[PDB]
Scaffold this active site. Structure first.
Site, PDB file in Angstrom:
ATOM      1  N   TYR A  91      75.099  69.603  57.909  1.00 33.36           N
ATOM      2  CA  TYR A  91      74.696  68.159  57.914  1.00 33.36           C
ATOM      3  C   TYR A  91      74.424  67.737  59.551  1.00 33.36           C
ATOM      4  CZ  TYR A  91      74.410  65.901  53.037  1.00 33.36           C
ATOM      5  OH  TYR A  91      74.385  65.993  51.963  1.00 33.36           O
ATOM      6  N   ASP A 120      46.681  56.314  56.719  1.00 32.18           N
ATOM      7  CA  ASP A 120      48.164  57.774  55.711  1.00 32.18           C
ATOM      8  C   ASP A 120      46.971  58.815  55.533  1.00 32.18           C
ATOM      9  OD1 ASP A 120      49.380  59.949  53.749  1.00 32.18           O
ATOM     10  OD2 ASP A 120      49.590  58.672  52.562  1.00 32.18           O
ATOM     11  N   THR A 171      51.426  63.949  55.420  1.00 29.70           N
ATOM     12  CA  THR A 171      52.202  65.209  54.610  1.00 29.70           C
ATOM     13  C   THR A 171      52.214  65.817  55.639  1.00 29.70           C
ATOM     14  OG1 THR A 171      50.816  65.535  53.808  1.00 29.70           O
ATOM     15  CG2 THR A 171      52.362  64.615  52.422  1.00 29.70           C
ATOM     16  N   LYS A 226      49.519  69.819  54.275  1.00 31.17           N
ATOM     17  CA  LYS A 226      47.994  70.143  53.284  1.00 31.17           C
ATOM     18  C   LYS A 226      47.304  70.742  54.364  1.00 31.17           C
ATOM     19  CE  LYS A 226      48.829  65.957  50.642  1.00 31.17           C
ATOM     20  NZ  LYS A 226      49.163  66.444  49.915  1.00 31.17           N
ATOM     21  N   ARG A 230      56.814  71.526  53.152  1.00 26.31           N
ATOM     22  CA  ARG A 230      56.262  70.552  52.023  1.00 26.31           C
ATOM     23  C   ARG A 230      57.672  69.331  53.252  1.00 26.31           C
ATOM     24  NH1 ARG A 230      53.775  72.065  48.186  1.00 26.31           N
ATOM     25  NH2 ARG A 230      53.492  69.704  47.288  1.00 26.31           N
TER      26      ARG A 230
END
Ligand code: FON
Ligand code: FON
Ligand code: 1W9
Ligand code: 1W9
Lengths: 442, 442
Positions: free
Chosen positions: A54, A208, A234, A237, A243
């Site tokens: 954590y 984006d 992201t 891709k 991811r």
């Protein structure tokens, strides 16, 4: 006090489905414009014990301790990110914690505008993403249309961003963010001209670049880092990472945006970061900077051009009539079929593509195009000459789709009925499977 | 064209930090209440190629095709999820797509009340989570206090949820959701009386059982499924899964909620699901249903009890004077030291714990307690008899903290100067490392 049996022994049921999935990936001509294939190194990071930890907060500012090795990973990743996109850590900052592309966009938009804040984005049907403010007449479909007040611009009937309408609307609506950079857009972007519309109304420029990220890093397409306040991408891709997502922010243009972005991510939206994701990103971003990856990206464009050209040579229409990037949108009107049908036909054939709206479509159900891209197939080693075959396979599928629609009708339900036990599709699948199954596979 | 050499050669810099982190993890006594250690099978799932797949939508209802094996994996995961928490196909649904606990809560709350909607949760300083509506004087700190309108109920000065305060507020504020189930709460919950309060005002009952999920599954603690409309849980704490979350909803009590929840997740908030996560959850959910895991959960409570009793035996005070679950909150007032200081002292000796507020504390900064929890050490194989040692290590650490405070003063920056090269801390660290480093390690 734990079971340490390998996945095979501990849960054979699931090891099977997964093993099946692997073979399907191995034996498919994957044209999903937003898919890629991660290498073994990335997947070692995703499966690393570093995710037991954590780490809520930021490096050197963690809530808990024992986070020194975590701090170094997060720092390496912010660093590798900033050099990857060829920006100076004095003008740009980056957050590496957003869990996905959609989370990054929501977070960044909130940071810039807050609840009830006004935003502009490209309509989904014209190639915008959901998180760009999408809604229809009877529903706020994305949170970005509900917690924000959004307005959606369109492409012109040639399939290009109608910049003049963008302005007709930005002066009328007076938004605080205008978003560009898209989900299904076959051409490069005029960020400079987005930057001038923004200024004229005192709005942030939101870029984006999730679909084109690699083109930006390798100076093959326009750099939005020269005009934008915020750039998101992201990592999974064309970038070929895990991811995850990145938010970049121009601090020279807006100091105190750093606190706004960093705090919108945590503690406004997320809790503890996923450290295996961050580790995986660090790993891919190294690779991104290497010249072997600029090579890869170059091949993606070469393949995309070659595919577009080969498709045109067999009398198939493309929206905008070509491509500048990794994706083509095929206009199927002249064949009197939908994209919905061709998606189904290509599925039967181990060809992954998806249906796409075209400007003349007044609805997302039963659209008249399909989207294809080259990042995945390039990763598998396909060169420009192989695009002929893929074009061959697509035209063949288009014809069969025309044939089956003539035999079973124009109703989606009826149509699908024709697919199993079709001799041509079985012959074609086997060609596909035989060529695909033998390509390089990470 | 991709690089498929092992992580060790491809990026040796990162592998080093990761190997370092692994050793810290193995040589530490981890008392962070929300941490655990995943087995090798869970981590094979996280690094599986199934995360190459885009799967927007739900099973049988995907936007793209080629999703048949991913459909199987998700359906398996929902099924095991309903099994593990002893609920029926027909009474309860589950969405396994949320990326983290904070996302599940935001998504679920929105589904229930929408933007500007009313929620009640436990204040963070009393043990509620950020996404239970947290704010302070200066800022709407969590989106869950800005997207929604929230009020925060407190525990009493004894450290228990004040059901009278809860009812009194719920009647004056008239909310639509009341959240219970907490981040730092050492006692079981009276859901029955929460259900009763929720009825008097026509409000939804939302139970976040992320910290106690295993106790709910194994029938060790009160079962919130009997009363709640929505139950959320993370999969990565006591449950011992990957980092992800689950939303359960009671259809039999709120028809039309299946849709409201499912569409809140996608497409309101998230995009493509993370399929490696879903696979890993599947893998862990099987394990949860085994009676061997019930055994493990029981060891967690037994250890927790033994640690509580041992701490008391050495005249250390605990909030609520004990624990019903996996976690203890130490009240440090009698020693005139803060949790902030003790955290620092324990970091020095390879003991992970975190500072915690006690009811008499008037702010998050410089609190008067620490939270400790037993699931991670239980995973590593510690039994009741080993709790004496943990308790002894913490008592010794409390004492050194008193000494260092006396030698250097009450300012935290001053205090830390005492830590490096302290004969006692180095002796203690070495005892910790010797005992910890040799415990079982998945
Ligand atoms: N250009 C583009 N942008 C995207 O965001 C996107 C693509 N393409 N391709 C796949 C698509 C899947 N997303 C969606 C999500 C919702 C609707 C939609 O119209 N919403 C209705 C559903 C229609 C109905 O079933 O009645 C709704 O009410 O939710 C469409 C596409 N997607 C990536 O996500
Ligand atoms: N009961 C509990 N709930 C939680 O959500 C939680 C814990 N404990 N333990 C660790 C903590 C870390 N979370 C936070 C996050 C923000 C603030 C906070 O007060 N935010 C202010 C800071 C202002 C200040 O420091 O003076 C802010 O403006 O961000 C406190 C704790 N955390 C897990 O998340
Ligand atoms: C410009 C942009 N931003 C964000 C996202 C969403 O990122 P997440 O899936 O949440 O990591 C996408 C992806 N879009 C669809 C997949 O829905 C795709 O291309 O096929 C995107 O193109
Ligand atoms: C009841 C509850 N709900 C949600 C979350 C948030 O889960 P995410 O971190 O978003 O997967 C937590 C975790 N809380 C802190 C760490 O954040 C911990 O205990 O230490 C939680 O206890």
């Amino acid at each position: 006090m734990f079971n340490n049996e390998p996945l095979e022994q501990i849960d054979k049921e699931l090891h099977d489905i997964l093993a099946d999935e692997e073979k399907r990936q191995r034996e498919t001509i994957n044209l999903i414009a937003s898919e890629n294939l991660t290498n073994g190194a990335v997947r070692e990071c995703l499966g690393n014990r570093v995710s037991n930890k954590y780490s809520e907060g930021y490096p050197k500012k963690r809530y808990y301790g024992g986070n020194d090795f975590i701090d170094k990973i997060e720092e390496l990743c912010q660093k590798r990110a900033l050099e990857a996109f060829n920006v100076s850590d004095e003008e740009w900052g980056v957050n590496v914690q957003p869990l996905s592309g959609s989370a990054a966009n929501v977070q960044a938009l909130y940071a810039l505008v807050g609840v009830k804040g006004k935003i502009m984005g490209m309509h989904l049907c014209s190639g915008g993403h959901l998180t760009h403010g999408f809604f229809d007449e009877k529903k706020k479909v994305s949170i970005t249309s509900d917690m924000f007040e959004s307005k959606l611009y369109k492409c012109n009937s040639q399939g290009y961003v109608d910049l003049d309408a963008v302005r007709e609307m930005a002066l009328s609506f007076k938004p605080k963010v205008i978003i560009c950079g898209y989900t299904s857009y076959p051409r490069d972007i005029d960020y400079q001209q987005f930057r001038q519309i923004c200024d004229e109304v005192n709005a942030y420029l939101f870029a984006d670049i999730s679909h084109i990220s690699s083109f930006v890093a390798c100076n093959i397409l326009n750099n939005p880092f020269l005009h934008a306040d915020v750039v998101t991408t992201t990592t999974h891709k064309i970038l070929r990472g895990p991811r995850s997502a990145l938010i970049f922010f121009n601090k020279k243009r807006n100091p105190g945006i750093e606190q706004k972005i960093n705090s919108a991510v945590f503690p406004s939206f997320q809790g503890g970061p996923h450290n295996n994701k961050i580790a995986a990103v660090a790993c891919q971003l190294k690779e991104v900077h290497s010249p072997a990856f600029k090579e890869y990206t170059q091949q993606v464009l070469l393949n995309s051009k070659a595919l577009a050209k080969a498709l045109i040579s067999k009398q198939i229409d493309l929206v905008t009539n070509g491509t500048d990037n990794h994706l083509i949108v095929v206009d199927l009107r002249k064949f009197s079929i939908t994209g919905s049908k061709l998606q189904e036909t290509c599925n039967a054939i181990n060809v992954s593509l998806n249906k796409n709206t075209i400007p003349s479509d007044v609805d997302c159900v039963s659209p008249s195009g399909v989207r294809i891209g080259t990042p995945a197939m390039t990763t598998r080693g396909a060169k420009e000459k192989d695009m002929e075959f893929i074009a061959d396979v697509l035209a063949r599928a288009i014809k069969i789709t025309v044939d089956l629609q003539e035999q079973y009708g124009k109703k989606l339900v009826d149509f699908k009925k024709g697919l199993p036990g079709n001799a041509q599709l079985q012959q074609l699948k086997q060609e596909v499977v035989t060529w695909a199954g033998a390509l390089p596979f990470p």
